[PDB]
Amino acid sequence: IVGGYECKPYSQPHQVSLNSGYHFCGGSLVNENWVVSAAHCYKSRVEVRLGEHNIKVTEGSEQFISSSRVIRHPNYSSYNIDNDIMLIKLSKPATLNTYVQPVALPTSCAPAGTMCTVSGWGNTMSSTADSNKLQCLNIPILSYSDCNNSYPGMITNAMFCAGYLEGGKDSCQGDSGGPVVCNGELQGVVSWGYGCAEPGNPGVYAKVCIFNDWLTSTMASY
């Protein structure tokens, strides 16, 4: 996260770290048995780490649980990184407490201008900000016109831009798969962009609200 601030410990209890010998992507807990992330973060098996603030230090609030199923969206495509969403089933249910709590799925699609929060353990491009400690940032959703103008012909029905055209504040490498929360609901998943925090190149996110039918039908299986 570039241009943000350190989150108050455990203020984003749905945030998770995906690990395969080291941290490589983020994710969000949506209920006791399922996690939502990005299709581009796919691996056949991964370890999900919940209840974290500093990923390099044992705090006593953590839960480490292996996956039993990793499901990428059936229509994912690398040409334009379309349909960048994935579901992960936990091998045993998570214990909900002061440190671990799920985030609600969308009751609507958020309109342009809405302020949201994005978080993660990715690159900070700062000499004072420690990426080992969870970082937070507030960003506004941009209009379709401004999003398409920045990336001509590359924006599909499953994407939205959020951030600042002036540059300076944005999500970055390592934040992939993480949450974008607006009005208390999960509206986006960190997906792609050209560089990080560059003027004229805002971040692009997967649009969760249009995937509701696939998400609910898929979770109805155990």
Ligand SMILES: [NH3+]CCc1ccccc1
């Ligand atoms: N806002 C850009 C986020 C991003 C950048 C590079 C790789 C993956 C995700």
Ligand SMILES: [Ca+2]
């Ligand atoms: Ca820790």
